[PDB]
């Protein structure tokens, strides 16, 4: 068994990936929440949403979709690994 | 990169501190998941992703 610092190295790898996925996903959620409040404001005044705004928003949604697919599996392996 | 550095950072922790980190990261996944789902409900009923028709 490969180890690093006394821990199984494949466990630390999955935790590394867990931490990194969550940090990116946090950034994406922050961008979505502000985009919603802008859009909420625009919609309240019957003002159009720019095409560029829609594109950026849709890009974040699809990126989140992939992060969540990676988060799944990684979360499973981390759970699987917690023998303790 | 900053990824191998994180891997080394984790391996240098005590067992108790690694476990707290795993628990914190799992809790963070759940909290972010609540945030994410709320903004997906908000965006749906603001129709941000309807295609232009006019």
């Amino acid at each position: 068994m490969e180890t690093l610092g006394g821990f199984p190295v494949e466990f630390l790898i999955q935790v590394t990936r867990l931490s990194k996925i969550l940090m990116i996903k946090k950034e994406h959620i922050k961008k979505l929440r502000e985009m919603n409040t802008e859009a909420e404001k625009l919609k309240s005044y019957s003002m159009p949403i720019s095409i560029e705004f829609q594109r950026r928003y849709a890009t974040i949604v699809l990126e989140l979709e992939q992060l969540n697919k990676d988060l799944n599996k990684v979360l499973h392996k981390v759970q699987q690994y917690c023998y303790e | 990169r900053d990824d191998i550095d994180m891997l080394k950072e984790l391996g240098s922790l005590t067992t108790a501190n690694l476990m707290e980190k795993v628990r914190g990261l799992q809790n963070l996944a759940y909290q972010l998941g609540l945030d994410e789902s709320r903004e997906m409900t908000r965006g749906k009923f603001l129709n941000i992703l309807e295609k232009p028709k006019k």
Partner: peptide, 28 residues
């Protein structure tokens, strides 16, 4: 079991929004 629904972005409106995003961008 459903704790993953939240943790991994699987709620009904998120799957809906992902569908709209694919359509808006022209992706399968």
């Amino acid at each position: 079991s459903a704790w993953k629904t939240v943790a991994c972005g699987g709620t009904r409106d998120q799957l809906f929004m992902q569908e709209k995003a694919r359509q808006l961008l022209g992706r399968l």
